[PDB]
Design a protein around this nucleic acid. Sequence first.
DNA 1: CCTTGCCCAAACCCCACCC
DNA 2: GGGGTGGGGTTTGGGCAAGG
Lengths: 86, 84
Amino acid sequence: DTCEYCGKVFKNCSNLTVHRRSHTGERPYKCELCNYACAQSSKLTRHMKTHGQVGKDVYKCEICKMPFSVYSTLEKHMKKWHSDRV
Amino acid sequence: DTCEYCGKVFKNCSNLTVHRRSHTGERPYKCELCNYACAQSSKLTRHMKTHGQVGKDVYKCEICKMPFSVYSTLEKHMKKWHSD
DNA sequence: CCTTGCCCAAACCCCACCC
DNA sequence: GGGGTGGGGTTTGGGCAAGG
Ligand SMILES: [Zn+2]
Ligand SMILES: [Zn+2]
Ligand SMILES: [Zn+2]
Ligand SMILES: [Zn+2]
Ligand SMILES: [Zn+2]
Ligand SMILES: [Zn+2]
């Protein structure tokens, strides 16, 4: 029908479903390699793209061995999650 | 009627044929205005509305003369097939 | 039975926002 | 040579049964 919170007209009900997920902070699609979750499956696919591409180098973390396809992303992960021992 | 591949029981045999097309991969219904093909005639009927409706504005591709109903789809098609 | 249209989740993609 | 996420939107695949 219509957005019960913001009153936005949607031509598709699935888009209204994901919009209501954004309003309610619902993230059903959770990553299996970290704590990240998102409201859309395509978001999860794009996120898993950052955990290492097929045929590409992977920078595993020194602490929890979390895979990353970009060194800067691994550095950010270490700075954000592994500051308990600095 | 039960699927010979996954064993799903249907209350309608035509549903079994359409579902089995997913296992076999056959796509009998092929669009005449693009490369799209599907296993269900109704899906092709729905897809044909992306090329435009009678009386509505239609954006035809400048190179391959492919009609479109949504300019966003036309832009995506131009990026996909015409990088020159 | 067979058509067909609807419902919903899922795919793909573009653009804007963030750290 | 930035890399990744959130919002937004078209389109598509799978399913299902009411009514031809
Ligand atoms: Zn809303
Ligand atoms: Zn992750
Ligand atoms: Zn780590
Ligand atoms: Zn099957
Ligand atoms: Zn087509
Ligand atoms: Zn074209």
